[PDB]
mmCIF file of C-alpha atoms in Angstrom:
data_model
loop_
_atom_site.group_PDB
_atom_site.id
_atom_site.type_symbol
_atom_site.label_atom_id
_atom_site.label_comp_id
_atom_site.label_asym_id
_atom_site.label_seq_id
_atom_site.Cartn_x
_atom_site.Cartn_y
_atom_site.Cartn_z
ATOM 1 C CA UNK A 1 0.550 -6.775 21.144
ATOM 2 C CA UNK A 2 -1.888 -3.970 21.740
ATOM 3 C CA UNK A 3 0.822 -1.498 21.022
ATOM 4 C CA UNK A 4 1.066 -2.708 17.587
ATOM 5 C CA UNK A 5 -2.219 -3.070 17.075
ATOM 6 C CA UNK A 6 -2.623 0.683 17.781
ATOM 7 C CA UNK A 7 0.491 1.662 15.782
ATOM 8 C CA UNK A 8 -1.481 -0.062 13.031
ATOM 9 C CA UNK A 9 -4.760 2.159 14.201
ATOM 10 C CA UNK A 10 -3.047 4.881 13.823
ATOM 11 C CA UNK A 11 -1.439 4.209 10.199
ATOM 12 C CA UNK A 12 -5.043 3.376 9.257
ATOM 13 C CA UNK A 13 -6.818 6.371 10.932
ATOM 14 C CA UNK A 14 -4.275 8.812 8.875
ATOM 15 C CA UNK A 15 -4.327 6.804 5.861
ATOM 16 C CA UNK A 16 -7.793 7.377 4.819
ATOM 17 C CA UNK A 17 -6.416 10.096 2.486
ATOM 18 C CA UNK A 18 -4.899 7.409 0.189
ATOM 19 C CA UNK A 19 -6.092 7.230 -3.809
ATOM 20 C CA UNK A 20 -4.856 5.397 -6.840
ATOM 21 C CA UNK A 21 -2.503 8.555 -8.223
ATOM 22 C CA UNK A 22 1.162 9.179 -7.970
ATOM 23 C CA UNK A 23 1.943 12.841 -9.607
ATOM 24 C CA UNK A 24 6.016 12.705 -10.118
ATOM 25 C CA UNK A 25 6.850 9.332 -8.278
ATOM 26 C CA UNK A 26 5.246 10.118 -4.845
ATOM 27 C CA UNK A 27 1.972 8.638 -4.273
ATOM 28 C CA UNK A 28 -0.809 10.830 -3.340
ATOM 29 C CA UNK A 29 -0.674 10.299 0.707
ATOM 30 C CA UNK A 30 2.795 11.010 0.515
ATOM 31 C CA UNK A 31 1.747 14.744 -0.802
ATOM 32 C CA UNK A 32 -0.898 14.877 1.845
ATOM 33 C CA UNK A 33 0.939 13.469 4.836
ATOM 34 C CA UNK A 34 4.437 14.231 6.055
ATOM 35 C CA UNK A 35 4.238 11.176 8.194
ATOM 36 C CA UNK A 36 3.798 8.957 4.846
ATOM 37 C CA UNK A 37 7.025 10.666 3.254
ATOM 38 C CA UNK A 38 10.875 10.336 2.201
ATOM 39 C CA UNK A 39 11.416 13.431 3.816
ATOM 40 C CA UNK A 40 10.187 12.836 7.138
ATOM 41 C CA UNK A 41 13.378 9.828 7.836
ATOM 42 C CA UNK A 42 12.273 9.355 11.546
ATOM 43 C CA UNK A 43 15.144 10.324 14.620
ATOM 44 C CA UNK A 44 16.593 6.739 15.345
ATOM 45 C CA UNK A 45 17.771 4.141 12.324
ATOM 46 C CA UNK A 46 20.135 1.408 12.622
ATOM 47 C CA UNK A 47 20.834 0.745 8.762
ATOM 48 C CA UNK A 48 19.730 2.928 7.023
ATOM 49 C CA UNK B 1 -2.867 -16.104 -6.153
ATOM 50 C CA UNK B 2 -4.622 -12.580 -6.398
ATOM 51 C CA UNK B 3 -7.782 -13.451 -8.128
ATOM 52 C CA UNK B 4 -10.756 -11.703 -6.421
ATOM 53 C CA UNK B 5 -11.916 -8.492 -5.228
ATOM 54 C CA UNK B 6 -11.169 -9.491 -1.710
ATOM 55 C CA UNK B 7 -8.049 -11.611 -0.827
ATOM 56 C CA UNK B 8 -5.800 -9.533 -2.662
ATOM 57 C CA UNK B 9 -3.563 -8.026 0.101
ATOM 58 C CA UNK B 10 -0.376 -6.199 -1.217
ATOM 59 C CA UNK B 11 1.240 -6.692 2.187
ATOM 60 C CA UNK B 12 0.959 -10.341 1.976
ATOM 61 C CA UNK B 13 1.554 -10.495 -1.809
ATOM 62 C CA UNK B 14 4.793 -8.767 -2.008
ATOM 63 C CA UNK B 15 6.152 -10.870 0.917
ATOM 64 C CA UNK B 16 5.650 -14.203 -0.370
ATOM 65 C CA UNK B 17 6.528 -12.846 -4.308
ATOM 66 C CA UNK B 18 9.742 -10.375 -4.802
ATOM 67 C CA UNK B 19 8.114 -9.137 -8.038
ATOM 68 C CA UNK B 20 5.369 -7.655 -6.277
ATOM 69 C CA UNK B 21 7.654 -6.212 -4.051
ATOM 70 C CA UNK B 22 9.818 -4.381 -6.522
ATOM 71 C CA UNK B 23 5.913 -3.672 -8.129
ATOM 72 C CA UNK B 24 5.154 -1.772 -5.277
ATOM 73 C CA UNK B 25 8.397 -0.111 -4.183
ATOM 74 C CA UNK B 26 8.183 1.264 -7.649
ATOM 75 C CA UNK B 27 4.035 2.024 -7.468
ATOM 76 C CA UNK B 28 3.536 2.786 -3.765
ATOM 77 C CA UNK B 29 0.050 3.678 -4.342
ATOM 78 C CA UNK B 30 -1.428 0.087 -5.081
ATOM 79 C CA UNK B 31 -0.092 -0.448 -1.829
ATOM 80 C CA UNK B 32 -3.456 0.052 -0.393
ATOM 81 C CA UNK B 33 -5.931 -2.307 1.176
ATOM 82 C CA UNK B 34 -9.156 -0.483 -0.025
ATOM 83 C CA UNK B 35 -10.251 -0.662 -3.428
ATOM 84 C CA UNK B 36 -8.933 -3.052 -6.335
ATOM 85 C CA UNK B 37 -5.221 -2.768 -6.454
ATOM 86 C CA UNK B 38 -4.636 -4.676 -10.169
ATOM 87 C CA UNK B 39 -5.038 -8.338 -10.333
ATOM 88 C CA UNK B 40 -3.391 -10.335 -13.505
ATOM 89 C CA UNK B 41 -5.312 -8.577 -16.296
ATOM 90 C CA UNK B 42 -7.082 -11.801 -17.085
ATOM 91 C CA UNK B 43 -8.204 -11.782 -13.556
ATOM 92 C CA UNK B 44 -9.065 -7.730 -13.293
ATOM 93 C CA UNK B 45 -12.641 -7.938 -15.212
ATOM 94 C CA UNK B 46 -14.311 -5.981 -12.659
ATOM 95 C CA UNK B 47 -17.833 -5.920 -15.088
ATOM 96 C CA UNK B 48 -17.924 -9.001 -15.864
#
């Protein structure tokens, strides 16, 4: 549970940088972060 | 029921509600907890 909870901490900590705007579809922490992105699609999926 | 400046979390919203859900999957920026994501415009009077 505390590993979760931190997971969360950490999605908070670098989602300060989050403001009512999307520019082309993205919203804006998606241009600042590349951990909030399409782009980055993460090593291990199971679906898709 | 998203009526007030608080108690208006997307992540609960869009998990009860599928129209929130596609709302936000095609708006990712109202995703956020911090300021006022819209309410129903007859609820969103944020002067009054």
């Amino acid at each position: 549970r505390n590993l979760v909870s931190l997971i969360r901490l950490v999605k908070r900590t670098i989602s300060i940088s989050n403001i009512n705007e999307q520019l082309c579809g993205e919203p804006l922490v998606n241009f600042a972060n590349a951990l909030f992105d399409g782009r980055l699609f993460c090593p291990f999926v199971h679906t898709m | 029921i998203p009526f007030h400046r608080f108690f208006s979390d997307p992540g609960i919203c869009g998990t009860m509600n599928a129209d929130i859900q596609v709302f936000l999957n095609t708006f990712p920026h109202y995703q956020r907890n911090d300021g006022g994501f819209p309410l129903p415009p007859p609820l969103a009077l944020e002067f009054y």
